[PDB]
Amino acid sequence: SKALISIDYTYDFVADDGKLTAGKPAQAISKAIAQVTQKAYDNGDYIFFTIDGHDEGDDFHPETKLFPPHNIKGTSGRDLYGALADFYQKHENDKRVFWMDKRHYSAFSGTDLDIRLRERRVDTVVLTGVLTDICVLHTAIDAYNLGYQIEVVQSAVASLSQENHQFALNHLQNVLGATIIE
Amino acid sequence: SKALISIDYTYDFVADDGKLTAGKPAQAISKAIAQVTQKAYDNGDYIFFTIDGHDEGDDFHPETKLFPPHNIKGTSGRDLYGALADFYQKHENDKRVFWMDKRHYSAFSGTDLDIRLRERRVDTVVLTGVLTDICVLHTAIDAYNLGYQIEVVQSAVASLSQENHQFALNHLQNVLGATIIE
Amino acid sequence: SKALISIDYTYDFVADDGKLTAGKPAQAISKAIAQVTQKAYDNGDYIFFTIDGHDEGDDFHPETKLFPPHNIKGTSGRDLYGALADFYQKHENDKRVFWMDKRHYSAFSGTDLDIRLRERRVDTVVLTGVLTDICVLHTAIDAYNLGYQIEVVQSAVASLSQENHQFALNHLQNVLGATIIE
Amino acid sequence: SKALISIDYTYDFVADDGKLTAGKPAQAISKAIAQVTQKAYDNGDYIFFTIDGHDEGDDFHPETKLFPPHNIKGTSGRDLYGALADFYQKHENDKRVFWMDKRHYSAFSGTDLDIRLRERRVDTVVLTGVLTDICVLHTAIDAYNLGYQIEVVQSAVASLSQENHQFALNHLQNVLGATII
Ligand SMILES: [Zn+2]
Ligand SMILES: [Zn+2]
Ligand SMILES: [Zn+2]
Ligand SMILES: [Zn+2]
């Protein structure tokens, strides 16, 4: 059917003292992203938490030259932010809810996301999380190239700047043919 | 060695009468993209022309909902614009120069670009062509996910608007770690 | 949606004078492979001819060291063998019939086969052609990893090595879970 | 730059009591596979343990119709067999030693193996583990399609029969251009 992808909504990307935080704009979607995730689950959708994870002793990651350390495996920075954490805790062992560690921006890159979606004959991915113009955008581009229909929940994605958030939404709708949802 | 990728610099994307033309901004790079391509070749680089091609009777293409017909196989719209066309004519049988038809925005999607690059142990791709924020950007994202170093020649890429061009260059540099060459 | 994959059933792989011919065992399937292809087409299936296309000099292709030149681009060696040639000629412009050049053994590698199948929401591939233990096997393994259901038409696949043919059929059924249609 | 791939050498695939065991033929390479892994690591190679792992009750897995439950995550069935287990324990935290869960036969499918190899500019993979004609073979075919040179250590891979072991070795050498070591 459909799969909701919950991209990088962690303490380090959202919290005031997060190591790579997008801050207020990211915090602003905390209630919405939790609500839409529960709704998707209620609707029978599959839910995939696709979460940046960096190993401590890893000097071969391109990001190391680009950003300070963040989302370190084994640390609290990788905790989900807001009520979304309660959803995951409550449904940790549900067959329809998945946690996938990732190391690139796209949720598809180096993961088994496409495999799990194909097993379930999912034709549509619904994207939520941060940042609209980076991990959301890269995930959508890979989804497009893999032939998925794409929906993006506008009230449940966010970027550092409104300008970049807007560029990303326009690209998603007008280049990738995604449906932007409330 | 390096490979220069020449992305979609065709009549339909560049020329005044092109079916999906980016117009003056695309035309403005015509001399530079030809020069940089010849230089790369003189310097020992492989050259890959990666060009949008639509089969006439193809209603399963995702772009059908978005754009009017363009770059139709067998038509003059797929002709290379400017002096670039003479470079290709002269090297049509050169084992170091390639023409690859593509159907998605990224030059890697559904093509054998990665295979040809890996055969040659290419570690760096040099991106040129149009549009900076779409086919160039998608190609760069795939390249990043595939572990290539990325250079982008600022004078030999163009977008529909300066704003989009700038979003893309910033993303290439700050998100993908690409070297912007001026 | 179903798709029938017609793998390398060409003069060089089948004919008495073919450059890498499997010989009588491959010729033995000529009527069957034509009939099953026509039937699949009559049933509404998509038909994909996935055909080795090589360059003589190519020291960058690992395969060049392993086998004599075969299926060279521009040569009669790439002609389809038997009545399959008439089928292709008659449907050369049919939206449901495709010709795809390939350079590796698998029909998926470096091609846009997965993309075309996903556009059509194909869930099952029907494999025919040669050789059972090389191109058919590699194509099947890729199809399995990409989440396709797989059928193999026993009367329409062949190898030179009958030992290897049986190994392949056993592997297809017992490892990949393919349906061997007999 | 070389990487040794250690494919599926677990209790469930190897031990007498393993849930999907290949039994004696797999047990036979226990000393050789541990030894060669240690040597590769000594030569400066990267070491990747690529290990079948099934989520409990996962009915969407294609193997569900093919094989009995095996290599269940969180169970002792996924323990490495023989001295190889001591290697992993001792080198768990070593930057050059990796553990990757996989669900298809190939070590590349749905994993980040290609990404990690590319980061390190590895051009050659050295294949060990079981079974020669299934997980080893599929990994090799993926490696070939991804442009890697391939070596296969004959004394540290094994199949259910010599016939299949030999089919796979011949395929690796003659079809994929692998070097048999
Ligand atoms: Zn990160
Ligand atoms: Zn187009
Ligand atoms: Zn061939
Ligand atoms: Zn298994």
Side-chain angles (χ1 to χ4, degrees), chain A residues 1-55 57-64 66-88 90-120 122-181, chain B residues 1-30 32-58 60-64 66-88 90-120 122-181, chain C residues 1-72 74-85 87-88 90-120 122-161 163-182, chain D residues 2-16 18-55 57-88 90-94 96-120 122-181:
Chain A
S1 55
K2 296 198 187 171
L4 184 137
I5 315 298
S6 185
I7 305 172
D8 286 342
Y9 200 72
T10 68
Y11 193 87
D12 274 342
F13 284 124
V14 182
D16 281 329
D17 65 353
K19 297 175 183 176
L20 197 48
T21 190
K24 299 186 175 185
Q27 292 164 30
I29 67 163
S30 177
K31 186 176 301 182
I33 193 172
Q35 287 172 340
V36 70
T37 300
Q38 179 72 56
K39 184 172 191 179
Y41 180 81
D42 296 338
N43 288 348
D45 293 352
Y46 301 102
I47 312 291
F48 292 84
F49 289 94
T50 61
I51 311 299
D52 193 33
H54 296 267
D55 289 294
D58 182 9
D59 325 314
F60 278 97
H61 199 297
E63 265 175 39
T64 297
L66 299 176
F67 304 111
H70 60 280
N71 290 322
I72 303 303
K73 287 183 176 180
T75 74
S76 74
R78 291 193 84 216
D79 287 355
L80 296 166
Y81 189 89
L84 195 56
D86 298 322
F87 178 90
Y88 179 71
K90 287 169 62 180
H91 299 278
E92 195 169 18
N93 301 314
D94 191 285
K95 292 279 191 55
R96 304 157 50 202
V97 175
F98 300 79
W99 177 288
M100 287 173 176
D101 297 322
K102 66 181 179 69
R103 294 175 68 255
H104 290 160
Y105 306 112
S106 168
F108 290 94
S109 183
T111 68
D112 73 334
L113 180 60
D114 186 43
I115 289 165
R116 301 291 195 143
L117 299 178
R118 304 255 313 146
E119 283 175 350
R120 288 146 183 81
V122 168
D123 53 37
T124 301
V125 294
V126 183
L127 307 182
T128 64
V130 300
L131 296 174
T132 322
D133 58 311
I134 304 174
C135 299
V136 176
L137 178 57
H138 284 209
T139 297
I141 291 169
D142 274 350
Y144 176 89
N145 285 340
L146 292 161
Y148 290 93
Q149 306 303 304
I150 305 166
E151 296 174 0
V152 179
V153 186
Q154 184 163 10
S155 61
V157 292
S159 181
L160 261 57
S161 67
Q162 175 70 209
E163 293 63 46
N164 285 353
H165 176 74
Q166 195 62 27
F167 161 99
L169 293 181
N170 287 340
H171 190 99
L172 297 153
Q173 181 181 267
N174 301 325
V175 180
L176 307 185
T179 300
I180 308 305
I181 293 202
Chain B
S1 188
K2 296 189 185 176
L4 181 141
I5 315 303
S6 178
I7 300 163
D8 282 342
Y9 200 71
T10 70
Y11 265 83
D12 277 341
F13 283 128
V14 190
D16 288 333
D17 55 313
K19 298 173 184 173
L20 204 57
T21 183
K24 307 280 290 189
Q27 291 156 10
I29 71 173
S30 181
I33 192 173
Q35 287 174 315
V36 64
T37 298
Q38 177 74 240
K39 189 178 169 190
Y41 180 83
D42 293 346
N43 286 340
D45 295 345
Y46 298 100
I47 312 292
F48 292 83
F49 290 94
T50 62
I51 314 293
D52 187 41
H54 288 263
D55 303 282
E56 221 168 37
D58 180 16
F60 278 97
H61 201 300
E63 279 173 20
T64 297
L66 306 172
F67 312 119
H70 59 280
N71 294 134
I72 302 301
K73 290 183 165 186
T75 75
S76 58
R78 298 193 78 221
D79 287 352
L80 291 168
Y81 189 89
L84 209 46
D86 296 293
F87 178 90
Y88 181 69
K90 286 180 193 172
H91 300 269
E92 176 178 344
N93 295 301
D94 191 313
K95 289 180 153 57
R96 290 172 52 204
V97 176
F98 301 79
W99 177 286
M100 288 173 178
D101 292 331
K102 70 179 175 70
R103 292 174 68 259
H104 291 159
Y105 306 111
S106 166
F108 288 91
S109 186
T111 68
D112 73 335
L113 178 63
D114 186 45
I115 288 162
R116 297 296 194 141
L117 296 173
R118 290 196 195 204
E119 282 177 349
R120 287 152 183 80
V122 169
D123 65 14
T124 297
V125 293
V126 182
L127 309 180
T128 64
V130 291
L131 297 163
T132 318
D133 57 311
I134 303 175
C135 295
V136 178
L137 183 57
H138 286 208
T139 297
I141 288 169
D142 275 348
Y144 175 89
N145 284 342
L146 288 163
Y148 292 94
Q149 302 311 297
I150 302 161
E151 299 175 5
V152 181
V153 187
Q154 192 168 11
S155 62
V157 291
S159 179
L160 210 38
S161 76
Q162 195 55 207
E163 305 71 70
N164 283 355
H165 183 71
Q166 205 56 49
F167 166 95
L169 293 178
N170 292 339
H171 190 100
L172 294 156
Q173 179 174 292
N174 299 317
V175 179
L176 311 180
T179 302
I180 308 296
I181 293 171
Chain C
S1 292
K2 277 198 191 173
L4 183 138
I5 316 305
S6 187
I7 307 172
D8 285 329
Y9 201 71
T10 64
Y11 267 69
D12 274 338
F13 288 116
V14 185
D16 284 341
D17 58 350
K19 300 178 191 175
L20 200 54
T21 181
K24 272 43 174 40
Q27 288 153 28
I29 68 167
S30 178
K31 315 246 287 189
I33 192 173
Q35 287 169 340
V36 72
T37 302
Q38 181 70 62
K39 174 159 191 168
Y41 176 85
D42 290 349
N43 286 355
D45 294 346
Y46 301 101
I47 309 297
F48 291 83
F49 293 90
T50 61
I51 309 294
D52 243 23
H54 289 302
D55 309 288
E56 279 166 334
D58 199 350
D59 293 304
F60 281 114
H61 198 331
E63 198 188 308
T64 299
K65 289 179 287 70
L66 295 179
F67 297 112
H70 60 273
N71 270 31
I72 301 306
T75 70
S76 69
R78 300 188 81 219
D79 287 349
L80 293 165
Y81 188 90
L84 214 44
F87 179 91
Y88 180 71
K90 286 173 181 181
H91 300 268
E92 190 178 10
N93 300 305
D94 194 299
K95 285 165 128 84
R96 298 160 51 205
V97 178
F98 301 79
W99 178 281
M100 289 180 176
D101 298 315
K102 71 184 175 66
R103 291 176 68 257
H104 289 160
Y105 307 116
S106 171
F108 288 93
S109 186
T111 69
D112 70 340
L113 178 62
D114 185 43
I115 285 165
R116 295 295 194 142
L117 294 173
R118 292 268 299 160
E119 286 175 348
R120 291 151 180 81
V122 167
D123 78 339
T124 301
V125 295
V126 184
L127 306 182
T128 64
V130 297
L131 293 186
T132 320
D133 58 306
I134 303 172
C135 297
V136 176
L137 182 61
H138 284 210
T139 298
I141 289 171
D142 277 349
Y144 175 89
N145 284 337
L146 290 163
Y148 291 96
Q149 304 306 308
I150 305 167
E151 300 182 331
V152 180
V153 180
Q154 182 166 353
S155 63
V157 291
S159 185
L160 192 158
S161 171
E163 287 83 19
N164 293 354
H165 173 75
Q166 196 58 55
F167 167 93
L169 292 174
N170 286 339
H171 187 97
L172 291 155
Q173 182 180 276
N174 301 322
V175 177
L176 309 184
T179 302
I180 311 301
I181 310 182
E182 312 173 61
Chain D
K2 282 193 194 178
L4 184 140
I5 317 301
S6 186
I7 302 171
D8 285 344
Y9 203 72
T10 65
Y11 183 90
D12 273 342
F13 280 139
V14 179
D16 281 338
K19 295 172 174 170
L20 197 57
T21 186
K24 276 171 59 193
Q27 295 161 18
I29 68 171
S30 186
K31 303 183 280 182
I33 191 173
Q35 292 168 1
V36 69
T37 303
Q38 179 70 234
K39 186 168 184 62
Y41 173 89
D42 288 343
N43 292 338
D45 296 347
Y46 300 102
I47 309 298
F48 293 85
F49 292 94
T50 60
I51 309 297
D52 186 41
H54 289 265
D55 303 287
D58 173 16
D59 292 311
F60 279 99
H61 199 304
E63 275 173 26
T64 301
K65 286 176 184 68
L66 298 176
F67 312 124
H70 65 280
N71 290 322
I72 306 304
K73 292 188 173 170
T75 73
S76 62
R78 302 184 78 222
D79 290 354
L80 295 164
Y81 188 88
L84 208 47
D86 300 330
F87 181 90
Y88 181 71
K90 300 204 297 183
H91 297 261
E92 195 167 353
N93 293 333
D94 188 298
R96 294 159 48 238
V97 178
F98 301 80
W99 175 286
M100 292 172 175
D101 299 323
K102 65 184 179 73
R103 292 175 70 257
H104 288 164
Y105 304 115
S106 173
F108 291 92
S109 186
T111 67
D112 74 336
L113 181 58
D114 185 45
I115 288 158
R116 299 290 197 143
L117 294 175
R118 295 270 298 164
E119 279 174 353
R120 289 155 179 77
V122 166
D123 55 40
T124 306
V125 296
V126 179
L127 307 181
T128 63
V130 292
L131 296 160
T132 320
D133 60 309
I134 301 170
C135 296
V136 175
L137 179 57
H138 286 209
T139 298
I141 290 168
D142 275 350
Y144 175 86
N145 284 339
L146 289 161
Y148 292 94
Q149 304 315 302
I150 300 165
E151 297 174 0
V152 181
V153 188
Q154 188 168 5
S155 56
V157 293
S159 174
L160 257 23
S161 66
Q162 178 71 191
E163 262 184 310
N164 288 7
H165 177 72
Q166 191 63 56
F167 167 89
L169 293 174
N170 284 347
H171 193 95
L172 305 163
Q173 178 184 282
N174 299 330
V175 180
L176 313 181
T179 302
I180 309 309
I181 294 168

